[PDB]
Amino acid sequence: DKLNNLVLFDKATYDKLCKEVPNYKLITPAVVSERLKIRGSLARAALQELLSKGLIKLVSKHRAQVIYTRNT
Amino acid sequence: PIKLARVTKVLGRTGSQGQCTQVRVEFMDDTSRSIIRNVKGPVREGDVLTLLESEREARRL
Amino acid sequence: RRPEHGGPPELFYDETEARKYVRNSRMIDIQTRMAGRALELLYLPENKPCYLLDIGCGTGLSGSYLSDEGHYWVGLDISPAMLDEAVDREIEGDLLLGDMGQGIPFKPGTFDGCISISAVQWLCNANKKSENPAKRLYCFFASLFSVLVRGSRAVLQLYPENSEQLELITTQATKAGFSGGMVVDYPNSAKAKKFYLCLFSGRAWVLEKKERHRRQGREVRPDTQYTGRKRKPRF
Amino acid sequence: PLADQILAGNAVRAGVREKRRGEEY
Amino acid sequence: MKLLTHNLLSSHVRGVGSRGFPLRLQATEVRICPVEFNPNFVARMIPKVEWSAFLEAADNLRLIQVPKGPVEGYEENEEFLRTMHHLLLEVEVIEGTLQCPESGRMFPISRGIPNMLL
RNA sequence: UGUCCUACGCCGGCAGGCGCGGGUAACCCGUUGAACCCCAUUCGUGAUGGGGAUCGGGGAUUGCAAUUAUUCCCCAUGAACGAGGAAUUCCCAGUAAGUGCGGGUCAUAAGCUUGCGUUGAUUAAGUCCCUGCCCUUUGUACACACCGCCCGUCGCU
Ligand SMILES: Nc1ncnc2c1ncn2[C@@H]1O[C@H](CSCC[C@H](N)C(=O)O)[C@@H](O)[C@H]1O
């Protein structure tokens, strides 16, 4: 049905990102938004936060596709 | 049981619109059985074919 | 190209084809537009609720048009995906799953009429070795003629691909005892050309002599206005 | 011959048909 | 599956023509779907309904509280027609089977449409 | 491409004004600074920042004249449209398709016909089933044709 993806993090799902997303073996704006049910604007805005905090390795930067990975 | 066959020579194209070609095949397990089959698409000599049932010989005019 | 080239109806109208059939703007328009013409084509009396057969109902678009006009109906279809979409649309009539080539499973003399919108031509092709187009068409119309009440009408919309399918449907239709005809709306147009089987249960003598002499090669007087004319009354 | 006529009616004719379709300096 | 439907259903098997009616019913779930009441409909379906099959099918459906005879009228017996409107067009068999007498072929209902295929 | 193509300077936010030059043209426009394309940003499945129709108000230009909006620009309105039951077109390699750029008509339109380059493939190297055309044999099947039935019943003048 219609998607009501959140535009800002609530308290429950923000914790769910910071202890589960850096262990998926693949982190992408589009695969985060399918499972955490958030907009893609924040789905990429949450990942540059995690990149600056050093929780994720960058694989490719492109205007069309961004690909991320676990640390170890 | 699945069976593999190698073609020997292409007899000619059959079907009303020529959508198939008729080719004589020979097997891989024992080079004695030579049955006649119909295939669609581009076929040349030496091609290896996967036959689902290697019992009946195909036929068309 | 045409949907019948894809294969059997139970596999072509799968789950993903059922969804895009529902949200198809052309389909919602023309399926009800033909069902309006097809319900009007069986000359059933007004202000009287009848019990109708929706053979090949599919999504139930033609089924909903009967219910909005105050009728009751049952639908028979072969693919479960189009039947699942019919349930989700909250339709009124009953739904039956089965192949119309194997027979319509009702008692004789049941329905006041039968409605058909683009389901018939799926029987002119047989995609199994056990299936035969002639026997599946005859098993349809013979069972239809039993189940339809006497004097009623069955109107069938169909999409033939050539002249031979119109013939091969018709001879199987008339061999089961039906009488009627073919109604073609706009018979020489392209987009609006719809086919509807309506079926219901009960001086000059001188000229040729001159030309015969011309064949014989003898000399003749030239053909003019005064060739055969009575000169004057004879006393 | 009968066997020639049967085998001609069992196999497919093929062969001749020429379809005409379609740098140094 | 309406009670009016199977009471007009038959068997399409080649051997059983045409004495396969009626078919036995079973149910493990029954839902009620409201249908608009038209007195003109049911009044002309009483001559067409076969009542002997309706009793045993309600006996299959465990319910006894039915009219025992032909309730024909000039649309004046609203108390009888609404109850059978609840019976015929409103009791739905969500899940169950059909039994053919002369073949024994299963016809299972799956939510809520029977299948009559080979 | 042209004596109508335009360069450059100034003014206005844009359409558009004022001035001064080059080129009858492998000489100027023009190293023809084209569009898709490429790299970053925002958007996040929502008839939505997709889609632009239809409208309201104003400004500018060509024309004797712009009303039924010649044309262009700015702000505002945001319709259907969610890949098209079914009739049918064109196509075998720098081809189809995506993308822009130029001549004949033309006081001014854009809209027809023609070309040009750019990015660039899936399928096929066959057949006479459908359509059309051209040959050979034949007038033996069907139809035409012949023979027959030629719908019956009673009722009065
Ligand atoms: N052999 C067959 N027996 C019964 N139904 C058949 C059938 N072959 C095809 N159908 C049905 O015919 C339907 C055509 S879809 C058209 C249904 C209807 N006009 C509507 O739009 O709602 C399909 O649902 C398919 O299931």
Secondary structure of E76-108 in the HEC alphabet? CCHHHHHHHHHHHHHEEEEEEEEECCCCCCECC
- C141 contacts C151 by C-beta, under 8 angstroms: no
Q: Which contacts (CB < 8 Å, 24+ apart) does range E79-83 have?
A: E81/E37, E81/E39, E81/E42, E81/E43, E82/E37
- Torsion-angle region of residue E76: left (phi > 0), alpha (psi -120 to 50) or beta? alpha
Triad C74, C12, C38: Cα angle to 5°:
40
Burial A11-31 (b: 16+ CB within 10 A, else e): eeeeeebeeebbeeeebbbee
CA distances to B21, B34, C141, E47 from C200, rounded to whole Å, are 48, 58, 12, 23
Residues from chain B that touch D12, judged by Cβ atoms under 8 A, are 11-14, 22, 60-61
Method of determination is: cryo-EM
From E74's Cα to the closest Cα of chain C, the distance in A is 15
- B59 in D contact zone (CB under 8 Å): yes
Q: Indicate whether residue C77 lines ligand 1 (CB < 6 A).
A: yes
SS3 content of chain B, % helix, strand, coil (to 5): 0, 50, 50
Q: What is the resolution of this structure in A?
A: 3.5
Nearest to C77 by CA among C117, C131, C44, C39: C117
Triad C72, C73, C77: Cα angle to 5°:
160
- B53 contacts B37 by C-beta, under 8 angstroms: no
Residue E44: CB partners within 8 Å, gap ≥ 6?
none
Nearest to C194 by CA among C64, C53, C40: C40
CA distance E25 to E99: 7
Stated as kind and residue range, the H or E segment containing B36 is strand B36-40
Q: Where do the structural domains in chain A lie, given as residue ranges?
A: 3-72
* Distance from chain centroid for Cα C147: 19
Ligand 1 closest atom vs CA C79: 26
Residues from chain D that touch B22, judged by Cβ atoms under 8 A, are 11-12
Beta bridge partners of A27: A68
| Counts for chain B of helices (H) and strands (E), in that order | 0, 4
Q: Indicate whether residue C31 lines ligand 1 (CB < 6 A).
A: yes
Which residue range is the domain that position B17 belongs to? 1-61
Count Cβ atoms within 10 A of the Cβ of residue C166 and give its class: 0-12 exposed, 13-18 middle, 19 or more buried.
middle
Nearest to D12 by CA among E89, B9, E50, C35: B9
Count Cβ atoms within 10 A of the Cβ of residue B9 and give its class: 0-12 exposed, 13-18 middle, 19 or more buried.
exposed
CA distances to C3, C17, C21, C36, C122 from C12, rounded to whole Å, are 8, 7, 12, 27, 11
CA distance B55 to B61: 20
CA distance B12 to B24: 10
From C190's Cα to the closest Cα of chain E, the distance in A is 37
Beta bridge partners of E31: E92
Nearest to C50 by CA among C66, C65, C32: C66
| Chain C residue whose CA is closest to E91 | C94
Count Cβ atoms within 10 A of the Cβ of residue A71 and give its class: 0-12 exposed, 13-18 middle, 19 or more buried.
exposed
Q: Indicate whether residue C180 lines ligand 1 (CB < 6 A).
A: no
Ligand 1 centroid vs C83 CA: distance in angstroms? 10
> Residue B10 CA to nucleotide F135 C1', Å?
31
From B55's Cα to the closest Cα of chain D, the distance in A is 19
Residue C203's Cβ-side half-sphere holds a number of Cα atoms within 13 Å equal to 9
Q: Which contacts (CB < 8 Å, 24+ apart) does range A54-62 have?
A: A55/A18, A55/A22, A56/A22, A56/A27
Please state whether at least 3 CB pairs lie below 8 Å between chains C and E: yes
CA distance A7 to C77: 45
* Cβ-nearest to C107 among E8, E113, E115: E8
- C19 contacts C99 by C-beta, under 8 angstroms: no
* Cβ-nearest to C48 among E10, E40, E112: E40
Nearest to C18 by CA among C76, C82, C75: C82
User: How many separate domains does chain B show?
Assistant: 1
The residue type found at D23 is E
- C187 contacts C193 by C-beta, under 8 angstroms: yes
| Token pair recorded at residue C129 | 């070795």
- C63 contacts C83 by C-beta, under 8 angstroms: no
Stated as kind and residue range, the H or E segment containing B12 is strand B3-14
The residue type found at E94 is I
**What CATH number belongs to A3-72?**
1.10.10.10
CA distance C4 to C121: 8
List all chains that touch chain C, counting a touch as 3 or more CB pairs closer than 8 Å: E
CA distance A71 to A5: 28
